[PDB]
Design an enzyme around this catalytic site. Structure first.
Site, PDB file in Angstrom:
ATOM      1  N   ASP A  54       1.449-105.501  -1.414  1.00  0.00           N
ATOM      2  CA  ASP A  54       0.820-104.419  -2.192  1.00  0.00           C
ATOM      3  C   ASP A  54       1.568-103.082  -2.023  1.00  0.00           C
ATOM      4  O   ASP A  54       1.478-102.459  -0.964  1.00  0.00           O
ATOM      5  CB  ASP A  54      -0.639-104.266  -1.718  1.00  0.00           C
ATOM      6  CG  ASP A  54      -1.371-103.116  -2.413  1.00  0.00           C
ATOM      7  OD1 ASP A  54      -0.989-102.734  -3.528  1.00  0.00           O
ATOM      8  OD2 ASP A  54      -2.309-102.566  -1.832  1.00  0.00           O
TER       9      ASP A  54
ATOM     10  N   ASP B  53       2.228-100.714  -8.824  1.00  0.00           N
ATOM     11  CA  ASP B  53       1.273-101.362  -7.924  1.00  0.00           C
ATOM     12  C   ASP B  53       1.360-102.900  -7.963  1.00  0.00           C
ATOM     13  O   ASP B  53       0.730-103.565  -8.792  1.00  0.00           O
ATOM     14  CB  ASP B  53      -0.143-100.924  -8.325  1.00  0.00           C
ATOM     15  CG  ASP B  53      -1.183-101.229  -7.267  1.00  0.00           C
ATOM     16  OD1 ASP B  53      -0.848-101.744  -6.194  1.00  0.00           O
ATOM     17  OD2 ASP B  53      -2.341-100.935  -7.524  1.00  0.00           O
TER      18      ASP B  53
HETATM   19  C1  LIG Z   1      -5.625 -95.951   0.969  1.00  0.00           C
HETATM   20  C2  LIG Z   1      -4.908 -96.193  -0.366  1.00  0.00           C
HETATM   21  C3  LIG Z   1      -3.403 -95.944  -0.243  1.00  0.00           C
HETATM   22  C4  LIG Z   1      -5.243 -97.614  -0.792  1.00  0.00           C
HETATM   23  N1  LIG Z   1      -4.588 -97.954  -2.060  1.00  0.00           N
HETATM   24  C5  LIG Z   1      -5.197 -98.155  -3.223  1.00  0.00           C
HETATM   25  O1  LIG Z   1      -6.405 -98.072  -3.348  1.00  0.00           O
HETATM   26  C6  LIG Z   1      -4.360 -98.506  -4.426  1.00  0.00           C
HETATM   27  C7  LIG Z   1      -4.879 -99.862  -4.911  1.00  0.00           C
HETATM   28  C8  LIG Z   1      -4.326-101.090  -4.151  1.00  0.00           C
HETATM   29  O2  LIG Z   1      -3.036-101.442  -4.665  1.00  0.00           O
HETATM   30  C9  LIG Z   1      -5.322-102.244  -4.270  1.00  0.00           C
HETATM   31  C10 LIG Z   1      -4.904-103.487  -3.437  1.00  0.00           C
HETATM   32  O3  LIG Z   1      -5.815-104.570  -3.572  1.00  0.00           O
HETATM   33  C11 LIG Z   1      -5.336-105.848  -3.086  1.00  0.00           C
HETATM   34  C12 LIG Z   1      -6.331-106.881  -3.562  1.00  0.00           C
HETATM   35  C13 LIG Z   1      -7.272-107.401  -2.655  1.00  0.00           C
HETATM   36  C14 LIG Z   1      -8.247-108.316  -3.065  1.00  0.00           C
HETATM   37  C15 LIG Z   1      -8.289-108.735  -4.398  1.00  0.00           C
HETATM   38  C16 LIG Z   1      -7.327-108.265  -5.283  1.00  0.00           C
HETATM   39  C17 LIG Z   1      -6.384-107.304  -4.892  1.00  0.00           C
HETATM   40  C18 LIG Z   1      -7.333-108.589  -6.727  1.00  0.00           C
HETATM   41  C19 LIG Z   1      -8.482-109.459  -7.148  1.00  0.00           C
HETATM   42  C20 LIG Z   1      -9.718-108.923  -7.543  1.00  0.00           C
HETATM   43  C21 LIG Z   1     -10.761-109.749  -7.953  1.00  0.00           C
HETATM   44  C22 LIG Z   1     -10.568-111.135  -7.978  1.00  0.00           C
HETATM   45  C23 LIG Z   1      -9.344-111.673  -7.603  1.00  0.00           C
HETATM   46  C24 LIG Z   1      -8.303-110.846  -7.190  1.00  0.00           C
HETATM   47  N2  LIG Z   1      -7.274-107.318  -7.430  1.00  0.00           N
HETATM   48  C25 LIG Z   1      -6.606-106.847  -8.455  1.00  0.00           C
HETATM   49  O4  LIG Z   1      -5.930-107.545  -9.182  1.00  0.00           O
HETATM   50  C26 LIG Z   1      -6.730-105.363  -8.670  1.00  0.00           C
HETATM   51  C27 LIG Z   1      -6.639-104.524  -7.562  1.00  0.00           C
HETATM   52  C28 LIG Z   1      -6.667-103.133  -7.678  1.00  0.00           C
HETATM   53  C29 LIG Z   1      -6.867-102.562  -8.930  1.00  0.00           C
HETATM   54  C30 LIG Z   1      -6.957-103.402 -10.053  1.00  0.00           C
HETATM   55  N3  LIG Z   1      -7.084-102.802 -11.332  1.00  0.00           N
HETATM   56  C31 LIG Z   1      -8.303-102.023 -11.568  1.00  0.00           C
HETATM   57  S1  LIG Z   1      -5.894-102.824 -12.323  1.00  0.00           S
HETATM   58  C32 LIG Z   1      -5.046-104.176 -12.149  1.00  0.00           C
HETATM   59  O5  LIG Z   1      -6.338-102.661 -13.684  1.00  0.00           O
HETATM   60  O6  LIG Z   1      -4.999-101.707 -11.990  1.00  0.00           O
HETATM   61  C33 LIG Z   1      -6.867-104.791  -9.927  1.00  0.00           C
HETATM   62  C34 LIG Z   1      -6.573-102.409  -6.382  1.00  0.00           C
HETATM   63  O7  LIG Z   1      -7.467-101.634  -6.024  1.00  0.00           O
HETATM   64  N4  LIG Z   1      -5.511-102.732  -5.634  1.00  0.00           N
HETATM   65  C35 LIG Z   1      -4.460 -97.440  -5.541  1.00  0.00           C
HETATM   66  C36 LIG Z   1      -4.141 -96.044  -4.988  1.00  0.00           C
HETATM   67  C37 LIG Z   1      -3.564 -97.750  -6.745  1.00  0.00           C
END
Ligand SMILES: CC(C)CNC(=O)[C@@H](C[C@H](O)[C@@H]1COCc2cccc(c2)[C@@H](c2ccccc2)NC(=O)c2cc(cc(N(C)S(C)(=O)=O)c2)C(=O)N1)C(C)C
Ligand code: NA
Ligand code: NA
Length: 334
Positions: A35, A220
Site C-alpha cells: 500500500d 494508491d
Molecule cells: C495514516 C494514513 C497515511 C493512512 N492512509 C490512508 O488512509 C490512505 C488509504 C490507504 O491506501 C488504504 C489502505 O487499505 C488497505 C486495505 C485493507 C483492507 C481492505 C482493502 C484495502 C480493500 C478492500 C475493501 C473491502 C473489501 C475487500 C477489499 N480496499 C480497497 O480497495 C480500498 C481501500 C481504500 C480506499 C478505497 N477507495 C475508496 S477507492 C479505491 O475508491 O480509492 C478502496 C483505502 O482506504 N486504502 C489514504 C490517505 C489514500
C-alpha cells in the site's frame, strides 16, 4: 547494490492484489496488500480476541512460535480512510521477495469485520514514507534501502487484468520492461513524504469538466479504484448518468460500453481510461446494474482534498515509485 527483487502478486477478481511475506523463525506466512497510501506493516495477532470474526478467518502471528521475535508492546492505532485496526508493535525478521529485513510491525488485536471479513489477504505492508508512518516506525522500504543491496531506490507495480496467469508484480529496486511498453513519463511529487503528485485537470468525454484549477492525485496501490472528493464525483457521476447506491455508483449494464473516456492530465501527458477500463461489465442486460470502478473519498487536509489513483489506474499504467528523485513514472502496461 545490484539487487532487483520481485514479489509475485495474486489478483483476486480485479479488486485485491496481494503477495506473501514470511515473518519470524521459522517463517509465518501472510498474504498482504502493498500500500503506497500508508507506511506501516501490520498482520493480525494470535492475541486478537476471537470475538473479532476477522481474526477467526485470518492467519494470526504467534510471537510464541518465533525465536527471532523482539518484544516492544507500544500501542498502535492505524486509521485508514475506509477502516481501522489497532494493536501493538513487535519486531521480527521479515522476508519479502527473497530480501530479509528486521522490521517493527503491528500485531493487530482489534480487527473490524468490515472491511476485513471481505479481504482475501491478512495484513498490509505500507510502501509510503516515514512521514506518514503512525508511531514514527521505520517503514519496510526504508529498512531495505539501508541494506544497500537494491540497484535503485525505486519500486514498481504491475497489476494484471483478471483471468497460467501472473496476477501482478512488484519489483524492488527497479522496473520490469516485460510489463510495459513505450517510455516512462514522470511527475514530481508535490513533496517528499507522500506518493502524491499535482494533477492539471480531469476531462470526461473531451471536456475538462473537472479539476479545472488543478488538484492532487495520490497514487494508491492499496485502493482498488479511482476516487475523487464527494463534490468532484457528484459532478463526474452526473456526466455519466450514473446512480448513487450506498457505497458505489451504477449504470444500466447495456449502457456500460457507451460511457465516455475519462482522462487524467498528469505532468503533461493525458492518461485516458475508456469505459471498459472503469465499468465492471458483468452482463450487458438492460435489466441489470453494473458498478463503476470510481468512488467518492474525502481525505482531510493536509493530505486531502485529493483524488486517489488505485488499481483501476495502475492496471492500465505500469507505475514506478522513485524515492531517489521524488517522482512517479507511468508507462503503458502490457
Ligand atoms: C495514516 C494514513 C497515511 C493512512 N492512509 C490512508 O488512509 C490512505 C488509504 C490507504 O491506501 C488504504 C489502505 O487499505 C488497505 C486495505 C485493507 C483492507 C481492505 C482493502 C484495502 C480493500 C478492500 C475493501 C473491502 C473489501 C475487500 C477489499 N480496499 C480497497 O480497495 C480500498 C481501500 C481504500 C480506499 C478505497 N477507495 C475508496 S477507492 C479505491 O475508491 O480509492 C478502496 C483505502 O482506504 N486504502 C489514504 C490517505 C489514500
Ligand atoms: Na454483511
Ligand atoms: Na460492502
Amino acid at each position: 547494490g545490484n539487487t532487483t527483487s520481485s514479489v509475485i502478486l495474486t489478483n483476486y477478481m480485479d479488486t485485491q492484489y496481494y503477495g506473501e511475506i514470511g515473518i519470524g523463525t521459522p517463517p509465518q506466512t501472510f498474504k498482504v496488500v502493498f500500500d503506497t497510501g500508508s507506511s506501516n506493516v501490520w498482520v493480525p495477532s494470535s492475541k486478537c480476541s476471537r470475538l473479532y470474526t476477522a481474526c477467526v478467518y485470518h492467519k494470526l502471528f504467534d510471537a510464541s512460535d518465533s525465536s527471532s521475535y523482539k518484544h516492544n508492546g507500544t500501542e498502535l492505532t492505524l486509521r485508514y480512510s475506509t477502516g481501522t485496526v489497532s494493536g501493538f508493535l513487535s519486531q521480527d525478521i521479515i522476508t519479502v521477495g527473497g530480501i530479509t529485513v528486521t522490521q517493527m510491525f503491528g500485531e493487530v488485536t482489534e480487527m473490524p469485520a468490515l472491511p476485513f471479513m471481505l479481504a482475501e489477504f491478512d495484513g498490509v505492508v505500507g510502501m509510503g514514507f516515514i512521514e506518514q508512518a503512525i508511531g514514527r516506525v521505520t517503514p519496510i522500504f526504508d529498512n531495505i534501502i539501508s541494506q544497500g543491496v537494491l540497484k535503485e531506490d525505486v519500486f514498481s507495480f504491475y497489476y494484471n487484468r483478471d483471468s497460467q496467469s501472473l496476477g501482478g508484480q512488484i519489483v524492488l529496486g527497479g522496473s520490469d520492461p516485460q510489463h510495459y511498453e513505450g517510455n516512462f513519463h514522470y511527475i514530481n511529487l508535490i513533496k517528499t513524504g507522500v506518493w502524491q503528485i499535482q494533477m492539471k485537470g480531469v476531462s470526461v468525454g473531451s471536456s475538462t469538466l473537472l479539476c479545472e484549477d488543478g488538484c492532487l492525485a495520490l497514487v494508491d496501490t492499496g485502493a482498488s479504484y479511482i476516487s475523487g472528493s464527494t463534490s468532484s464525483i457528484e459532478k463526474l457521476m452526473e456526466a455519466l448518468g450514473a446512480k448513487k447506491r450506498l457505497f458505489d455508483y451504477v449504470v444500466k449494464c447495456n449502457e456500460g460500453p457507451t460511457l465516455p473516456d475519462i482522462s487524467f492530465h498528469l505532468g503533461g501527458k493525458e492518461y485516458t481510461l475508456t469505459s471498459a477500463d472503469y465499468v465492471f461489465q458483468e452482463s450487458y442486460s438492460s435489466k441489470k446494474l453494473c458498478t463503476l470502478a470510481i468512488h467518492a473519498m474525502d481525505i482531510p487536509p493536509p493530505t486531502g482534498p485529493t483524488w486517489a489513483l488505485g488499481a483501476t489506474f495502475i492496471r492500465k499504467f505500469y507505475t514506478e515509485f522513485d524515492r531517489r528523485n521524488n517522482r512517479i513514472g507511468f508507462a503503458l502496461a502490457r
